[PDB]
Coordinates of C-alpha atoms and ligand atoms in Angstrom, one line a residue:
X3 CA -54.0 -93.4 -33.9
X4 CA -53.4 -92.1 -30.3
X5 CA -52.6 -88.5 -29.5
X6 CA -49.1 -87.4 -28.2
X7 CA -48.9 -85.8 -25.1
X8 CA -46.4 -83.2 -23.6
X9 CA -45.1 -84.1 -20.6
X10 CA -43.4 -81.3 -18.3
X11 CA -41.0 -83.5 -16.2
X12 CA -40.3 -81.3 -13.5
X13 CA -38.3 -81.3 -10.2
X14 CA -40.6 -80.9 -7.8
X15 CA -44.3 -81.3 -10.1
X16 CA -44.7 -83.0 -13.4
X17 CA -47.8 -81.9 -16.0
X18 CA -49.6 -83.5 -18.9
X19 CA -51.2 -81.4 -21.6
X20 CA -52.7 -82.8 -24.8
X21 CA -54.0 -80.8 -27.8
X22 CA -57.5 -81.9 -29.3
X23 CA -59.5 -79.3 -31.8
X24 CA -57.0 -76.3 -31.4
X25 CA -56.8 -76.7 -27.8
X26 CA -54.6 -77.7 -25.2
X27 CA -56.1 -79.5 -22.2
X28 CA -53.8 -79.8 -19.0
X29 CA -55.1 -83.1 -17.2
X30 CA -56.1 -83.4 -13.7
X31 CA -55.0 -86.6 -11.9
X32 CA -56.8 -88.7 -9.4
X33 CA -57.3 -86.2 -7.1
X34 CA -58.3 -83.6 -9.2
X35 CA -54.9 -81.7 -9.1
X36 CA -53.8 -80.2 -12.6
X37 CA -49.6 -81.2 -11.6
X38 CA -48.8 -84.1 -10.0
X39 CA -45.4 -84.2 -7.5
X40 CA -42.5 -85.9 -8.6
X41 CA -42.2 -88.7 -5.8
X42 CA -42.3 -92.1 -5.6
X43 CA -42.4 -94.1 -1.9
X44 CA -41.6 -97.7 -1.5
X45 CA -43.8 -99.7 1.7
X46 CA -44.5 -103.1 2.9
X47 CA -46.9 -103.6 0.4
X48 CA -46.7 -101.2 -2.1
X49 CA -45.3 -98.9 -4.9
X50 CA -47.4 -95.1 -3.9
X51 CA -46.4 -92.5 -6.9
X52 CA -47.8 -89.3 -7.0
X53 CA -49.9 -87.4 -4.5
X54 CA -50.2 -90.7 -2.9
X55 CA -46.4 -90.4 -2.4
X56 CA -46.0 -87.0 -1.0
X57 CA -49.0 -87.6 1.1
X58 CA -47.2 -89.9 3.3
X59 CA -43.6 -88.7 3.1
X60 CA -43.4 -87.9 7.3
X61 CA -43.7 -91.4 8.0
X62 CA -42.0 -93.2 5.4
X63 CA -38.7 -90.6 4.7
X64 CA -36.0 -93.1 3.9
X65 CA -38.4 -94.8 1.4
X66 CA -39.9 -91.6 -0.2
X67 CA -38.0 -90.4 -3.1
X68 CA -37.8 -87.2 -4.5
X69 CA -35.1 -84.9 -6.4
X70 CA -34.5 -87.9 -9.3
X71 CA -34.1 -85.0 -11.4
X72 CA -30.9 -83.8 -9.9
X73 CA -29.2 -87.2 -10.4
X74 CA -30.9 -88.0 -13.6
X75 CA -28.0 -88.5 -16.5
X76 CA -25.2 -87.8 -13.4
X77 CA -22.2 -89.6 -12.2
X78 CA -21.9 -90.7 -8.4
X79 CA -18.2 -88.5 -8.2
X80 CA -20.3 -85.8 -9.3
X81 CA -19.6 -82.6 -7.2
X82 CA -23.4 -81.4 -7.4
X83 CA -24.4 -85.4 -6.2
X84 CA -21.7 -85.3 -3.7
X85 CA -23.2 -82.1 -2.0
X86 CA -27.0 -82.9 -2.7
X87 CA -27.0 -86.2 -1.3
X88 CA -25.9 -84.7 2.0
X89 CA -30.0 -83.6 2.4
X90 CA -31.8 -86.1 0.9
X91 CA -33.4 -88.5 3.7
X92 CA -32.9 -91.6 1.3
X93 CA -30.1 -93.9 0.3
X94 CA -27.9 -93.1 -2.5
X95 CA -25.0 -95.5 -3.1
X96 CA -22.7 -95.9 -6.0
X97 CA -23.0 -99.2 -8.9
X98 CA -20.1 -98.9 -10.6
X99 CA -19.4 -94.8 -11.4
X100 CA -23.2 -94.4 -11.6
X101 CA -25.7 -93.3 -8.5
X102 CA -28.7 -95.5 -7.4
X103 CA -31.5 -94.5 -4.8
X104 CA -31.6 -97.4 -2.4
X105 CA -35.1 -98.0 -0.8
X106 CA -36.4 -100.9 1.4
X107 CA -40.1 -102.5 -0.7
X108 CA -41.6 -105.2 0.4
X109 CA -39.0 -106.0 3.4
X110 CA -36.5 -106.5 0.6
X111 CA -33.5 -104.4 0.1
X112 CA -33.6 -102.9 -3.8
X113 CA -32.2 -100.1 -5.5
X114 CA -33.2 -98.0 -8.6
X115 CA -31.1 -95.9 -11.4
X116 CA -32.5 -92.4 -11.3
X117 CA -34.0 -93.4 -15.0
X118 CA -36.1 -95.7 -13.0
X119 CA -37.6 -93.5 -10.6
X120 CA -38.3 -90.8 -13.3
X121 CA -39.8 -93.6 -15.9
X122 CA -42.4 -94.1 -12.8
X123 CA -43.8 -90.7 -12.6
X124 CA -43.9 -90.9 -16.1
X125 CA -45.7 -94.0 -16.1
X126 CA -48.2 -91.7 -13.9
X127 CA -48.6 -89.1 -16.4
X128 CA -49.3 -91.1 -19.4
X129 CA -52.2 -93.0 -17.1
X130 CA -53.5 -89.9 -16.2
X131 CA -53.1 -88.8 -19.7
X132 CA -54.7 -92.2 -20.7
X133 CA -57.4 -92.1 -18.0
X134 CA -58.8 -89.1 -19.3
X135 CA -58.5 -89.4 -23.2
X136 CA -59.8 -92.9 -22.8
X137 CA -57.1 -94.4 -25.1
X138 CA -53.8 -95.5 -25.0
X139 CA -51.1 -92.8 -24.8
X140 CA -48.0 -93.9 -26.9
X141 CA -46.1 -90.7 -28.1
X142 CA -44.8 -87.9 -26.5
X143 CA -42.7 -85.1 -25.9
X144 CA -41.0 -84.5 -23.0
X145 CA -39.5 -81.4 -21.5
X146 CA -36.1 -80.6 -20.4
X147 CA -34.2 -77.1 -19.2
X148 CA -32.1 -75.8 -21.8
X149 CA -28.8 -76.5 -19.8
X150 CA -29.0 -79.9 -19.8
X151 CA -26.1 -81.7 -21.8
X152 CA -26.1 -84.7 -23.6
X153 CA -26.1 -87.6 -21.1
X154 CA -28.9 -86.1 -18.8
X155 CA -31.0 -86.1 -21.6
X156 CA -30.0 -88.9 -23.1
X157 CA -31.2 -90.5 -19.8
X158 CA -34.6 -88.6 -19.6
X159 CA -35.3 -90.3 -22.7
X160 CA -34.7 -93.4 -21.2
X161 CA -36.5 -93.0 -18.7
X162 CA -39.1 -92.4 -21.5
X163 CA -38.6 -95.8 -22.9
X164 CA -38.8 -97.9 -20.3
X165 CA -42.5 -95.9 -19.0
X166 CA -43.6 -97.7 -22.7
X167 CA -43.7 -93.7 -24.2
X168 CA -42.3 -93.5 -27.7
X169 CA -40.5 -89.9 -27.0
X170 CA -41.0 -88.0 -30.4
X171 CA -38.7 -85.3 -28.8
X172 CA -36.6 -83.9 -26.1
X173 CA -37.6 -80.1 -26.2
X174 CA -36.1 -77.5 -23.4
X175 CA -38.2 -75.7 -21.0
X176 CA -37.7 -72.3 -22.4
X177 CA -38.8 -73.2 -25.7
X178 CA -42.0 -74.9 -24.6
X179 CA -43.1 -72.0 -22.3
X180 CA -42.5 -69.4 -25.7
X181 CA -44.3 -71.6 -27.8
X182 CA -47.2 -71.7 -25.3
X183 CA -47.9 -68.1 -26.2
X184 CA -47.8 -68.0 -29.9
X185 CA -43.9 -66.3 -29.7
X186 CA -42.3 -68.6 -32.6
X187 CA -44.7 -67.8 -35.2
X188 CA -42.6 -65.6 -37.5
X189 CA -42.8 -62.2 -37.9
X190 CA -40.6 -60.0 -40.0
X191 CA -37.7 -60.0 -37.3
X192 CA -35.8 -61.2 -34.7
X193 CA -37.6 -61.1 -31.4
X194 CA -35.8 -61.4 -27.8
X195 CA -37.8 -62.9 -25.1
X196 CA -37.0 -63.4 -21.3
X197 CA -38.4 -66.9 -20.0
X198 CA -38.3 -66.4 -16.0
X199 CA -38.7 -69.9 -14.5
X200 CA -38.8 -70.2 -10.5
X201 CA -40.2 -73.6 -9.8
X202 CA -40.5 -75.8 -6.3
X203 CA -36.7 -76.2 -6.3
X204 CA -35.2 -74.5 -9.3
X205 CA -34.8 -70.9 -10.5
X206 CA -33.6 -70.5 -14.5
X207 CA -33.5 -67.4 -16.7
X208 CA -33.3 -67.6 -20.3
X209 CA -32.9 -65.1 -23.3
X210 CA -34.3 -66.4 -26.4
X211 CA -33.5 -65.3 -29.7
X212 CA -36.6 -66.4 -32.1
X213 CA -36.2 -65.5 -36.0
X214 CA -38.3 -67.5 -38.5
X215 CA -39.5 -69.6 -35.8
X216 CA -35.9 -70.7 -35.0
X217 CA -34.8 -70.0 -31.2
X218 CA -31.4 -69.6 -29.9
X219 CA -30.8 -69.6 -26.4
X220 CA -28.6 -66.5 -26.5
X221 CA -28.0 -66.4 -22.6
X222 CA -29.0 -68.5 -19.2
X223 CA -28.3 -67.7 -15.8
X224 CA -30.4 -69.0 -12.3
X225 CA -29.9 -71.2 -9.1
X226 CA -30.8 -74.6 -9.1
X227 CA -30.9 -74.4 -5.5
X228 CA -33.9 -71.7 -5.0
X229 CA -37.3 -72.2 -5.4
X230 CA -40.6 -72.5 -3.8
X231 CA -39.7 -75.0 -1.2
X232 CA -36.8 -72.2 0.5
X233 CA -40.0 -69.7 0.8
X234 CA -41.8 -72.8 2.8
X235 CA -38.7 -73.2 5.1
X236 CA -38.7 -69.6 6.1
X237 CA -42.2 -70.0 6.9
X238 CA -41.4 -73.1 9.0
X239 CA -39.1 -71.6 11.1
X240 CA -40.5 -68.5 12.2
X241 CA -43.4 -70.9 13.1
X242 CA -41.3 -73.0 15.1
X243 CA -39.9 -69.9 17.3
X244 CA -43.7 -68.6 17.5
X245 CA -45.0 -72.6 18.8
X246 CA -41.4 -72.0 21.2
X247 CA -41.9 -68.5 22.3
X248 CA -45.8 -69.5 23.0
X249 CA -45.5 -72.7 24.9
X250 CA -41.8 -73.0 25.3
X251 CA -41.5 -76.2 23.3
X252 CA -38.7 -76.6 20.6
X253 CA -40.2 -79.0 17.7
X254 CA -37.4 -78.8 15.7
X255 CA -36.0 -82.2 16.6
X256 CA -39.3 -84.2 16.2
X257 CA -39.5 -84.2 12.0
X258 CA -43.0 -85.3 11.8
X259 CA -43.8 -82.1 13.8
X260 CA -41.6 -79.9 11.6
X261 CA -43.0 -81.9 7.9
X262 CA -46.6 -81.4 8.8
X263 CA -45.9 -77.7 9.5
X264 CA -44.1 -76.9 6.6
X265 CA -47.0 -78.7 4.4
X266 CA -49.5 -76.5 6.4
X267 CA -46.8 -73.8 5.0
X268 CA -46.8 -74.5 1.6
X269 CA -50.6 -74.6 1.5
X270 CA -50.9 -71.2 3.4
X271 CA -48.4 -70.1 1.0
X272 CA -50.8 -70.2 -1.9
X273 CA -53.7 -68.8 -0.5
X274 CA -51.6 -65.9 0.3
X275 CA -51.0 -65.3 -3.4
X276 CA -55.0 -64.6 -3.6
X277 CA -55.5 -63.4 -0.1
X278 CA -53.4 -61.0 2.3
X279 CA -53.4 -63.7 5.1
X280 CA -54.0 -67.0 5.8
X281 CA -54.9 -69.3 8.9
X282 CA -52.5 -72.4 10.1
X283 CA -54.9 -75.4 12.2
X284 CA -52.5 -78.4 13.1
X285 CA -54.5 -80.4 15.5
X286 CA -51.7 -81.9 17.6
X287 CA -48.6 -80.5 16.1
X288 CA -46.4 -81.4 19.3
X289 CA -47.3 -83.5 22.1
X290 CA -50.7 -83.1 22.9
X291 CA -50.9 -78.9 21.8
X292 CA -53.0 -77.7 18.7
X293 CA -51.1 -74.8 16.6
X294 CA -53.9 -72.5 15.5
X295 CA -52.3 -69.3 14.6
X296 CA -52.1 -67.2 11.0
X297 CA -50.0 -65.2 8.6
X298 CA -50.4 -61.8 6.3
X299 CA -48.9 -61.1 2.9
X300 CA -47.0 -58.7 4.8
X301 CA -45.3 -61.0 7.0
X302 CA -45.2 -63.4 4.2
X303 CA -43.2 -61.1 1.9
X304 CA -41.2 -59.8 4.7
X305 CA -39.3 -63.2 5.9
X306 CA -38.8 -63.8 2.1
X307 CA -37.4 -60.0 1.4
X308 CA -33.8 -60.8 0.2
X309 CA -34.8 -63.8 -1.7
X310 CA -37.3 -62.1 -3.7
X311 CA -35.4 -59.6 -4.7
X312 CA -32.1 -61.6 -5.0
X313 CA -34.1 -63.1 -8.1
X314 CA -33.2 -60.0 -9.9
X315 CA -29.4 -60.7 -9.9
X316 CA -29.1 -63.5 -11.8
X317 CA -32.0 -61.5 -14.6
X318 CA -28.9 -59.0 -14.9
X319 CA -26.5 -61.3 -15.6
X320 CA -28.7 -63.4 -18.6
X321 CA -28.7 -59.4 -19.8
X322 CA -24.9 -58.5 -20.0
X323 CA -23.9 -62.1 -21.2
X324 CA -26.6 -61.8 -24.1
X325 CA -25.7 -58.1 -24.3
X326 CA -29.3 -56.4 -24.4
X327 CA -30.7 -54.2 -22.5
X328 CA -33.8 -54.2 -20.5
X329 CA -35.3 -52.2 -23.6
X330 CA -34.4 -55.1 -26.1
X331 CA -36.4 -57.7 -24.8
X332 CA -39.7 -57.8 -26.3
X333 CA -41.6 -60.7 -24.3
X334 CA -41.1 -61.9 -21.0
X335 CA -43.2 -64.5 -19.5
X336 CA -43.5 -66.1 -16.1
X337 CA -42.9 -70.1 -15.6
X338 CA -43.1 -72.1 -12.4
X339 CA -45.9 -72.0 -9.7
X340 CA -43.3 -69.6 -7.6
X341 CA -44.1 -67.1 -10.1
X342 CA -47.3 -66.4 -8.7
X343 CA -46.4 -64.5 -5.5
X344 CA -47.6 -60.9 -6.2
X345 CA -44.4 -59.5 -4.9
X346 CA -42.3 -61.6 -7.3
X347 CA -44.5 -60.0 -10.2
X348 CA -44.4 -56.8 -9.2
X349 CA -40.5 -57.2 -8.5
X350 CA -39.7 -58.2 -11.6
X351 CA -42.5 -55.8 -13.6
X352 CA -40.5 -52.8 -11.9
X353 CA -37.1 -54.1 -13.0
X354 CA -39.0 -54.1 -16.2
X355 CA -40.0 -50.3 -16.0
X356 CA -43.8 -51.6 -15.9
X357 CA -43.4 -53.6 -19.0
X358 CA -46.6 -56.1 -19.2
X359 CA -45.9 -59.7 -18.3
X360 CA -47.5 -62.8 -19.9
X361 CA -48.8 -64.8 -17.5
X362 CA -52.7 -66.1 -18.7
X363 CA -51.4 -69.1 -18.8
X364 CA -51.2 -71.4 -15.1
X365 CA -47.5 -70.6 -15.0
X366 CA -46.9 -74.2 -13.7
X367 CA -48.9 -75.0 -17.0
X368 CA -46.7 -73.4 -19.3
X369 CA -44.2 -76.0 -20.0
X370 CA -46.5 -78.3 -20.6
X371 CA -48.9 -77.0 -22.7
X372 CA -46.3 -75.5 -25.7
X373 CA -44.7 -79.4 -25.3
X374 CA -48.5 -80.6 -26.1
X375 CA -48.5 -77.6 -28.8
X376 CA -44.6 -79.2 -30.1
X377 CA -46.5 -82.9 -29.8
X378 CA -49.3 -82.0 -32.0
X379 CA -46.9 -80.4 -35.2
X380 CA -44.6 -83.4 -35.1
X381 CA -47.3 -86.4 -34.8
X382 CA -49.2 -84.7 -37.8
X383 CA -52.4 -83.3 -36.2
X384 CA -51.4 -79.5 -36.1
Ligands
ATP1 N1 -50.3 -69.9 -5.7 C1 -49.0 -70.2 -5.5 N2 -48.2 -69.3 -4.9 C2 -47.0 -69.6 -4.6 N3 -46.4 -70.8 -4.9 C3 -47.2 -71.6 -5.6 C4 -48.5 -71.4 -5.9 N4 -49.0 -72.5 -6.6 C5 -48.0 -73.4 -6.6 N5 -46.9 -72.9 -6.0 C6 -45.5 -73.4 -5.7 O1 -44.8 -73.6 -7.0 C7 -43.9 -74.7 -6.7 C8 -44.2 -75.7 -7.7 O2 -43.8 -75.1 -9.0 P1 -43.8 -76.0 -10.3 O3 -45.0 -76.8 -10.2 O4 -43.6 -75.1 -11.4 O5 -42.5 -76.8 -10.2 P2 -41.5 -77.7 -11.0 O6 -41.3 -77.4 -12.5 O7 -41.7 -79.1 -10.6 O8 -40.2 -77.3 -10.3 P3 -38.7 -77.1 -10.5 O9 -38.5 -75.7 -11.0 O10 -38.3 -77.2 -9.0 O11 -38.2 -78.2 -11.3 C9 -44.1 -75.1 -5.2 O12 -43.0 -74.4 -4.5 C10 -45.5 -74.7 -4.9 O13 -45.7 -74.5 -3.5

């Protein structure tokens, strides 16, 4: 046999987990990074997926694809693609009422069903998956968020089927992260939990309803336009008036500039979740000028103000349409990397009235590791 994997498909990062001997291992790729980003570039002579991918995205931007995820299962007159593609540096175009990503490989002109694109960073996962177990990876399970209808994940099991995965099952998000922590083994009643997802591009809330190990997604509310990446940008462009006010250069128009700040951004960005400031060294950022400078928690949490604690609107609205209270939620637990900014917890722990929040578990990891938990029941080996 061959064990199945769970596979956490997300927006903006994608995670493996497999469970062996009561545990679930989350696999590191090539690089030794425990999620993997959910692009795919097209060059003269080569197909880059991965970390390769988004490594190289400021030189190749009409090639690099990204956001698959948004058009996955979609139709071309669909408002949302309407409005999305307006931001996305690549080539959408329309075959026939369905969207394709148009890219430029090999000097040749070819074009790719959002199925496509997904089914390679799948193809990713299950050789990373593959890499490490040191056998081949057939089944799997593979993630999905609770609003999704039928056609979207209709076509993220497609995408399944062509990466050569036999998908044993199209679990949502919510459900995956409560299973993580042991919340569907059944108790003597019903038991509310609060799933608060805020990934790189996406924020969801759920209410789950769990009685006899049997969810029900009594309420959902979120923005699928907020996430870790708007947190970056307000990073980006206070650094671009500091690099203006200090040498009177605007870099905004040069967007190699602007992408290799915003990646020194998202990678002070996590540092500050550990440490109360952080140092930015771009050798070269414009012309010939270096851009040492740094940033504090404080300031960090301060450009970001009304969009951390915006995130607390839509957590009242999953209440009133699931009519509970804040008292009638028993478990709430934090999903997405975004999750880990301090201020966020603490945020959220208040709205709570200091309630305790689970959160042992890599919050990016989450997903993953209850679809490896879902994988194991349903193949035989749990
Ligand atoms: N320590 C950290 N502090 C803050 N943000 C972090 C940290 N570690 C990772 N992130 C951020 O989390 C985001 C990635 O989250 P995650 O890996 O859950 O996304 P995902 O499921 O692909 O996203 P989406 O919700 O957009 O579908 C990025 O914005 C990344 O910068």
């Amino acid at each position: 046999k061959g064990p199945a994997v769970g596979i956490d498909l997300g927006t903006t990062y994608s995670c493996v987990g497999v469970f062996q001997h009561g545990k679930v291992e989350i696999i590191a790729n090539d690089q030794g990074n425990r999620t993997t980003p959910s692009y795919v570039a097209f060059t003269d002579t080569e197909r880059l997926i991965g970390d390769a991918a988004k490594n190289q995205v400021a030189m190749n931007p009409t090639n690099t694809v990204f956001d698959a995820k948004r058009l996955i299962g979609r139709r071309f007159d669909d408002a949302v693609v309407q409005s999305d593609m307006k931001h996305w540096p690549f080539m959408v175009v329309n075959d026939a009422g369905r969207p394709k990503v148009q890219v430029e490989y090999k000097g040749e002109t070819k074009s790719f069903y959002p199925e496509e694109v997904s089914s390679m960073v799948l193809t990713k996962m299950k050789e990373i998956a593959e890499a490490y177990l040191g056998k081949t990876v057939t089944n799997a399970v593979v993630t999905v968020p609770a609003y999704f209808n039928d056609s979207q994940r209709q076509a993220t099991k497609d995408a399944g089927t062509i990466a050569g995965l036999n998908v044993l099952r199209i679990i949502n998000e919510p459900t995956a992260a409560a299973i993580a922590y042991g919340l569907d083994k059944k108790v003597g009643a019903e038991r509310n939990v609060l799933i608060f997802n805020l990934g790189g591009g996406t924020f969801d809330v759920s209410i789950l309803t769990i009685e006899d190990g049997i969810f029900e997604v009594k309420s959902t509310a979120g923005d699928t336009h907020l996430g870790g990446e708007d947190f970056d940008n307000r990073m980006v462009n206070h650094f671009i008036a500091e690099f203006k006010r200090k040498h009177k250069k605007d870099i905004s128009e040069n967007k190699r500039a602007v992408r290799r700040l915003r990646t020194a951004c998202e990678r002070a960005k996590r540092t500050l979740s550990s440490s109360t400031q952080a140092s930015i060294e771009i050798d070269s950022l414009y012309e010939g000028i270096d851009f040492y400078t740094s940033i504090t928690r404080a300031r960090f949490e301060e450009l970001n103000a009304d969009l951390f604690r915006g995130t607390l609107d839509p957590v009242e609205k999953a209440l009133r349409d699931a009519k509970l209270d804040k008292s009638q939620i028993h478990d709430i637990v934090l999903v997405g990397g975004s999750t880990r900014i301090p201020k966020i917890q603490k945020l959220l722990q208040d709205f709570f009235n200091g309630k305790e929040l689970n959160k042992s578990i890599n919050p990016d990891e989450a997903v993953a590791y209850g679809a490896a938990v879902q994988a194991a029941i349903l193949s035989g080996d749990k």
